[PDB]
Every structure is written in structure tokens, then in C-alpha cells.
């Protein structure tokens, strides 16, 4: 023998959707963080008045 082979190889990235399209769902989850609180804001002060 007298054999030394030490080797390397390269990676295959699984198609993780591979587009920005993920953002739109992320935009919906923005808005549900965003547009919800003022309901309570005006709710508690509607209840004050």
C-alpha cells in the first residue's frame, strides 16, 4: 500500500425556497405585531371615558 489519501468534498444546499417570497408571510407577521396594540390602547381609554 504505502497509501495516504486525505480528501475533501463539497456541499449540496437543499432548495430552501431560494427566493425572497418568505417576506410576504413575514410581512403578515409584522402587521400582526404592529396593527394589534392600538386596539387595546383605544380600548382601555374608551373604557376610561
Amino acid at each position: 500500500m504505502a497509501e495516504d489519501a486525505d480528501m475533501r468534498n463539497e456541499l449540496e444546499e437543499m432548495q430552501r425556497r431560494a427566493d425572497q417570497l418568505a417576506d410576504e408571510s413575514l410581512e403578515s407577521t409584522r402587521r400582526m405585531l404592529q396593527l394589534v396594540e392600538e386596539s387595546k390602547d383605544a380600548g382601555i381609554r374608551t373604557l376610561v371615558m
Binding site: 432548495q15 430552501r16 425556497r17 418568505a22 408571510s25 403578515s28
Partner: peptide, 15 residues
């Protein structure tokens, strides 16, 4: 691996 994203879009925009 995209239909659940479409639900993540759709069910949550519905929400």
C-alpha cells in the same frame, strides 16, 4: 417545503 409557507402566508393573513 413551500405549502406550509403558503399557509404561513394565508392562514396568518387571514388571521
Amino acid at each position: 417545503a413551500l405549502s406550509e409557507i403558503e399557509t404561513r402566508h394565508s392562514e396568518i393573513i387571514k388571521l
